[PDB]
Design a protein around this nucleic acid. Sequence first.
RNA 1: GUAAAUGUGAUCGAGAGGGAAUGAGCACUGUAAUGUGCACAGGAACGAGGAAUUGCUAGUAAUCGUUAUCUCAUUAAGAAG
Lengths: 192, 65, 76, 151, 117, 142, 144
Amino acid sequence: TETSGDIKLFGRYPYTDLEVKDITLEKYINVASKVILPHTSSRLNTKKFGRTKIPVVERFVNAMMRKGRNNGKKTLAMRIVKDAFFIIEGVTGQNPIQILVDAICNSGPREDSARIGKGGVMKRSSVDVSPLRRINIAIFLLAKGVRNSTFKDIKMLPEIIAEELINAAKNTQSSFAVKKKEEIERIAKSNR
Amino acid sequence: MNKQMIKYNADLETTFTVERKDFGRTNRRCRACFAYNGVIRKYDLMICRRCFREYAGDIGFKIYD
Amino acid sequence: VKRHERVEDDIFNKIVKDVKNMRILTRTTLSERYNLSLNISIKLLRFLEENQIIKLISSHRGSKIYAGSKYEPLKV
Amino acid sequence: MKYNVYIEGTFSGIQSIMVEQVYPITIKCSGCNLVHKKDVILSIDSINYTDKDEKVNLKVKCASCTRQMYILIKSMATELYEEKFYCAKKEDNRYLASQLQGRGCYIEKIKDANIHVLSEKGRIYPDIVFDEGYWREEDNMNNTSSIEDFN
Amino acid sequence: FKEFSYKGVNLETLTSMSISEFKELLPSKLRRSINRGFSAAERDFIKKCIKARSENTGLERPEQINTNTRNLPILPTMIGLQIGVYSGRDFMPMVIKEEMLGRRLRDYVETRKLCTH
Amino acid sequence: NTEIFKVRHDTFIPALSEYLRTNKTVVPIKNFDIIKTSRGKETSPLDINWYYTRAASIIRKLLISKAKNEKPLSIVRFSSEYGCAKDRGNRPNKHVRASKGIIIKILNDLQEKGWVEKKENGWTLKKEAEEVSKQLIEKLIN
Amino acid sequence: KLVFNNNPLPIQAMIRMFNTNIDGKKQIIKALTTIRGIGDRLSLAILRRAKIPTDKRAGELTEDELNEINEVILNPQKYDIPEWMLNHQNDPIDGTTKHLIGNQIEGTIRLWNERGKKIGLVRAFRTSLGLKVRGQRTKSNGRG
RNA sequence: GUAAAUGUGAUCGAGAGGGAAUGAGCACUGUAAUGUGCACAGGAACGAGGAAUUGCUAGUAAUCGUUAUCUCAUUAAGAAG
Ligand SMILES: [Zn+2]
């Protein structure tokens, strides 16, 4: 219908010339795999690092099927994010994809708190997070910020997605996800 | 048995007959043990769940899966 | 205070001056900046998109999105 | 730790203040210094035991450090009105309702207490509600009962 | 003051109607019971009521009529009579007043004593 | 050819509805303005001309049935086609049929105009009802 | 200068129909659900016989429109609303069918229950004590 | 009584969510309504749950209907698929 060219996301977005821009993250973020629609059934979850090979916007829609009542409603999630990309592409002026990439980069906490004490009482200490866990937490926080913001507010959900992601990419205090990344890093330092 | 009952119309003078329908436990007693409870009625068996399990292998039922 | 069921003349006048230089605008903005109800943010927004003052950029199911005089899209 | 629960304010036309010994409380673990994620209802009628068979009104495990926390209510009531209501002990310009005894925790806040008033005319006002720290009632004989600056 | 009335009809007319006519007044579930015809027991009860209202004269009361016909709707032929309805234990006595029309005899007798702990 | 499939349903059902009303080929049931389409529905229709959208969609069911050479359509078939999920308080929702009375009236109206013929096991189209549809589509796609 | 020409009329805050108050800002459908005896379903029935657009707000209606609706409430059977749409069908005391509005409902239920109690109808005795009468079990649920 | 979630367009707008106790009716099953369906009302608590506590590693958990499966005249808010 719309095009007879090369594969673009939602048939709209360029799908090339994409940079991660944190060498600690490089291997764990799939922006290679050209797909027309953020849907795949590829059975990688039954593997040792197979959940790191799933494409980026896929991981991002999965995060929306939550709050219990929305389990399994993956079409609804795609409908929501499609609209958000229109809002963001407009607002930012750059491939929605680079906004999403930079949101992840900023929103993962680098140091964390954990119990270390084995042969006695369990005493809390700071510890250093792996690349993979760092990105897992980034998606979690971005999602949790969005969900709770929309609950009993008149604004449309696709609009709230655009509010948070811009701010997160720009590392502003305005993001719920960014603030909570500061909190975790401050407490980690308190227990250092 | 299909039993019959007389009934009178509103005049209390004319009479008509109606048939009692056979339903409920009263005629579905277990064919092995006369029990009224837990009778399997499927495939025109009329045998209780206790009696079924001892005879099932004689009838020809098996647990494949 | 509760929301309103009219767009009076002086609110109407200043909305025209405000809708230029705004980028993407939506049902909520008219109803959360000014005091209008959702049932009168629809009617005013639909009117401005007939007058060529704004332009519609999406209308998928009931989700409906508009643009003003300082919008500019991506380029290849 | 011991905490006295006072009822403070300016009292007019009041014979006695009676208090339900049921306190929604915020508790902090004295081991890891973490606040319990929810308020807990501390009631005098709740019967629990320490690991040494001592009666307590609350037994809670800290979710973070697994330490046991215990609270006992000691009613400071001088009498029971109608065998139901704990009459708070009058002390100068305030009323001592109870003493809370915490072990393994601190009590950070008491949120609310259900309060009943006995007027100088022998009228009971059950479950009084404060508006901005004020309560006032008038009887059919124009006697006023009031509490101002409630704390 | 006006005469007693049921669904538009005066007690004078109502006491003269056939059961077939009275059926056009009653609620739906009671109508269905009269359409499906009376039992042999119910017929004896009704014939005794018709006999009794006819036989009784002067100021002396007629004797009580007992029945286990619990589901029978009350009819204008047993007005003023004393009737005993079986409670599963005993014949509980009652007088059939005008205001009872449109209800079954089971509606005026309790098979289970009220509970007070 | 199977000419009906060349145009989109949400353009065809509204298109025929006007041709019906301007010739009054079907006449509303008594109290159409307050009756519901099923016991499963919550409120009566939002469009006063719902009766005509039913008439327009009934002829569509018949055109596609004719196109695929199915067996003739029955009053039961149509009732299950228009069915829905009824709300039952504190219980799961349950599938329920459309009401037959509307459908019966439409089919008897169409019979009198010679648009629908009754067979022994269902209802079927007639030449005039096919040609109206044909001549509409030939403008509508262009 | 251009003009909007699609604005509602100058609106009143609240109005009186039935010894009941109706919020003028509210759209006519959910607004007539303030009067006792006008549920959702019957509210739509009246408005389409009085012939008022459903989308106007209650404070925009003229005196004329309020008389049109007032007339249809006092006598629905005149404007072809059938009896199976109405509150009180085959009245035991009158034979007729009628539609009870406002405080008439409670008054009629009371005089009815009171009559049953005067003659010992078991159904009326239970409702007076707060008990149930539609066969529901009373052991597990419905306490206090 | 031959899916429902679901797909498109309208509509409604923050107790137009919710359907508990109850009225005069209109039908069905039945030997008998006390059981079930329907229409018009009526419109209770509940605004996400204390101490505790139960399963679940992939077409799994949770959601959505459906049973020419079992009970069954009429009755599923139960099991077994
Ligand atoms: Zn047996």
